[PDB]
Amino acid sequence: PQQKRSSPSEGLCPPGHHISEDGRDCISCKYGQDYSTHWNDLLFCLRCTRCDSGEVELSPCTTTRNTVCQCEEGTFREEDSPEMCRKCRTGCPRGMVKVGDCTPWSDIECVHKESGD
């Protein structure tokens, strides 16, 4: 009933750690470098992501959560454009009115994508 640091529960280590090779200890992930979000048996924690020059960091990487990055103001990203933030349109085309402003996850929304006038 006496111990020290970390041992695997049912063969799984806690978030913020990874498991030893065969010897079985639970090693901590390195803050700012890698992490693990769930109980696991990874031999290596997961590498943190670095926000690129077109993004801003909302929260840093921790041994428990990956960095959270977001497109910089004036640009946005969607499900089919995960690779590069796209420049938001300044205004709607001739004949169409706003209705939706630029978000980090969406360009401007313009109406006459049905409506009268």
């Binding site: 979000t37 769930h38 696991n40 048996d41 990874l42 997961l46 499900e79 089919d80 454009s81 995960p82 690779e83 590069m84 796209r86 085309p93 001739r94």
Partner: protein, 163 residues
């Protein structure tokens, strides 16, 4: 001795299977290609690996060269002031004994022209070696899945035991 490899291809017209039971990924980018054929044909096969919900399942632990070719083929009729600009990305993931899928490889292309442009042909191939444990699962996910041409000689997915 015992050969460990696979090469599975699109189903041409059946293109996408899924249906209601379908099958998916998770925190994975793009959308999982779920329609690979699962049986012997004159152009595909599975030897000591099998298919489940679009994912190749590993039986023997080891180093695997994994590859996939995905053909983005589309005719496009733009209009007035731009909105057309496509990012064509092929992702290769693995599911291990960890809740979330883990990216192994990505390869991307972006459409160019705009307005004055009739169509686009973009075949994307990538491959590389990764260590996998028995029961690890690998799949392919892509953006703009609606532009993928699934003829069997065009889009495919495979792997074989290295060394």
């Amino acid at each position: 001795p015992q050969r460990v490899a696979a090469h599975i291809t699109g189903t041409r017209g059946r293109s996408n299977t899924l249906s209601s039971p379908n099958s998916k990924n998770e925190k994975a980018l793009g959308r999982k290609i779920n329609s690979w054929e699962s049986s012997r044909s004159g152009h595909s096969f599975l030897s000591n690996l099998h298919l489940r919900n679009g994912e190749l399942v590993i039986h023997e632990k080891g180093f695997y060269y994994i590859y996939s070719q995905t053909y983005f083929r589309f005719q496009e009729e733009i209009k007035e002031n731009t909105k057309n600009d496509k990012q064509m990305v092929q992702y290769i993931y693995k599911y291990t004994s960890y809740p979330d899928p883990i990216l192994l490889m990505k390869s991307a292309r972006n459409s160019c022209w705009s307005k004055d442009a009739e169509y686009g042909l973009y075949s994307i191939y990538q491959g590389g070696i990764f260590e996998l444990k028995e029961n690890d699962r690998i799949f392919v996910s892509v953006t703009n899945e609606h532009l993928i041409d699934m003829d069997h000689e065009a889009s495919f997915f495979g792997a074989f035991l290295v060394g």
